[PDB]
Design a binder for this molecule. Structure first.
Ligand code: HEM
Ligand code: HEM
Ligand code: HEM
Ligand code: HEM
Lengths: 142, 147, 142, 147
């Protein structure tokens, strides 16, 4: 569970992330695909899985838009994500172990974009946030 | 990979006392139920609506007997597992688009089936130790050609 | 989340397990220690980590007794596990990735002792149960 | 582990452009804060009572430096990492009782600190791909002698 202090930490860093949300999304998804190629299994219907390609850019935005919205929903991420959990489970059939892979790459991308602001305390809070978000996407499985 | 004589003997001994034609189907059926995102790959294989549907499915069964025979060549050469699965690894990745994490999950289902078949005495902790090491090497090999 | 049926399924298989609870605990712990020797890192203070040894039999009981009680608390697993999560987090400093390792080994042992009863459907429900148990033990970390 | 020419060049170039005396301290402090159970091993290194103390902690700083110089040996010889770490693996298991899952966690913190230092253009997706493969091979070698 997130503390008050985790939540304040998340919102503060998202203050920096939001203006670069699309680029950050593209970077995170590009890295998950190239660095952890096990994840390409879900995306072969795309025209490309190369970093910065049009499909990767388009979907990076889609992902980040959702995560940006979660930041305003940290009092109940599981409720907020139910429909999205259902979609990944039933329609997309994504092995939920991949959610943490995405989380890891976003953390890498945030550090890279905001090295001064991304202290260990901020990093801890964001990791807590993203792990909960992963758990919430996993909630409606099985 | 550094096998001990004990591990080598255990894996060979264990593989000898199981029927691959029985364990294979049980393990895959168990996978589709316990890890149901894996159904993604078997929608052409007939009826899979409920757990009941899956377990008597002779397609799921025939490909189950295919997976285990796949491990036959690994037990045959414990020292060359990486090279044994190059072809299969690229097939699962580029043709079939199987998330290689499902290999781990299938291995775990195999372990559960073998344990239930042989019991706690025969499938002792040391036997399981050797068998898990074996499965981990095979899973790694099957994932080796994902890029 | 556990459904109503998951809860019924867990209760049902635990009816078989309970008459062998002590033996099952020692078997599950013994296999974690032996098959996943990474986990031995936490138990070097014991006189033995050998299967069926005195420390392993004793602690096998401690574990299974607790899991046995969790079965009576499937509606509030997280709360029920609040003290024990903090204990594992702060006193014992156990990396929570190990909790799923213990789950897997218990599942193997239940299968070995109750092959007829441990159908994929029951296995599914037990696995959901143990993963929630693992998550609840992880709740008071960080 | 078959290194492409590109991966090898990426890893050597990366390693040459970071200050291990800057990164090591940063990644170990980060680990101890983000994966707090790791403090199990460092409670004798002075004040770790807060995030700030850990990050200002001279002992933890010195120890981060030795981790990084531990990795220098891997970079010097990408083709023999398993044997490079044999003795170190034994030590961490049998003397120190370090859960080897913490090697993975430390590697991930090293990634994060390298990314912060270099930024996303220099530490591109392909560089991260080579660095990750390097770290995974290192982590496996460190875990290899646990029994
Ligand atoms: C963990 C954070 C994640 C978030 C916030 C997220 C969010 C989303 C959203 C909002 C959509 C659009 C769904 C719609 O049509 O309304 C989507 C689609 C999708 N997600 Fe995720 N997702 C995440 C992780 C993952 C991971 C790790 C994978 C696989 C590695 C994955 C696989 C997919 C796929 C295949 C689609 C469909 C895209 C397409 O067909 O073009 N997701 N996701
Ligand atoms: C122990 C792990 C596995 C092994 C050893 C294995 C082995 C094999 C083999 C030998 C084949 C047939 C290759 C040929 O035609 O020459 C095959 C095909 C196939 N595998 Fe796998 N496999 C494994 C895991 C999986 C997993 C986890 C999935 C997905 C959940 C999967 C999905 C498929 C599919 C869809 C086919 C094609 C079936 C067909 O011919 O219609 N496999 N595998
Ligand atoms: C996931 C299911 C688990 C349950 C239900 C469980 C339960 C317990 C309980 C009830 C105790 C005694 C607490 C007390 O002293 O009052 C305990 C102690 C302990 N647990 Fe766990 N545990 C689990 C998993 C693990 C795992 C996976 C590890 C490490 C790999 C671990 C490491 C320890 C250690 C080191 C002790 C202290 C034992 C001693 O010092 O003698 N636990 N556990
Ligand atoms: C990147 C992976 C790692 C590498 C390359 C590494 C390398 C080393 C080296 C070179 C030493 C010094 C050995 C000597 O003095 O002869 C050492 C000691 C030590 N390491 Fe690690 N290490 C790693 C990860 C870890 C982790 C994750 C932990 C625990 C959280 C850990 C805990 C320790 C401890 C407690 C010592 C002894 C320090 C002392 O005596 O004060 N190491 N390691």
């Amino acid at each position: 569970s997130l503390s008050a202090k985790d939540k304040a930490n998340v919102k503060a860093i998202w203050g920096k992330i939001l203006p670069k949300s699309d680029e950050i999304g593209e970077q995170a998804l590009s890295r998950m695909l190239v660095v952890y190629p096990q994840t390409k299994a879900y995306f072969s219907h795309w025209a490309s899985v190369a970093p910065g390609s049009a499909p990767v850019k388009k979907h990076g935005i889609t992902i980040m838009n959702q995560i940006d919205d979660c930041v305003g929903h940290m009092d109940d991420l599981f409720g907020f994500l139910t429909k999205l959990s259902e979609l990944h489970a039933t329609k997309l059939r994504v092995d939920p172990t991949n959610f943490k892979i995405l989380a890891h790459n976003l953390i890498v991308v945030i550090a890279a974009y905001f090295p001064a602001e991304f202290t260990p305390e901020i990093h801890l809070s964001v990791d807590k946030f993203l792990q909960q978000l992963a758990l919430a996407l996993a909630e409606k499985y099985r | 990979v550094d096998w001990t004589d004990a591990e080598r003997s255990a894996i060979v001994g264990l593989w000898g006392k199981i029927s691959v034609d029985e364990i294979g189907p049980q393990a895959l059926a168990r996978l589709l139920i316990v890890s149901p995102w894996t159904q993604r790959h078997f929608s052409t294989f007939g009826n899979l609506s409920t757990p009941a549907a899956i377990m008597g499915n002779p397609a799921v069964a025939k490909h189950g007997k295919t997976v285990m025979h796949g491990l036959d060549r690994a037990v045959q050469n414990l020292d060359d597992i990486k090279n044994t699965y190059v072809t299969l690894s690229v097939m699962h990745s580029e043709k079939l688009f199987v998330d290689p994490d499902n290999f781990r999950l299938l291995a775990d289902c195999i372990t559960v089936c073998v344990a239930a078949k042989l019991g706690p005495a025969v499938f002792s902790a040391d036997t399981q130790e050797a068998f898990q090491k074996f499965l981990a090497v095979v899973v790694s090999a099957l994932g080796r050609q994902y890029h």
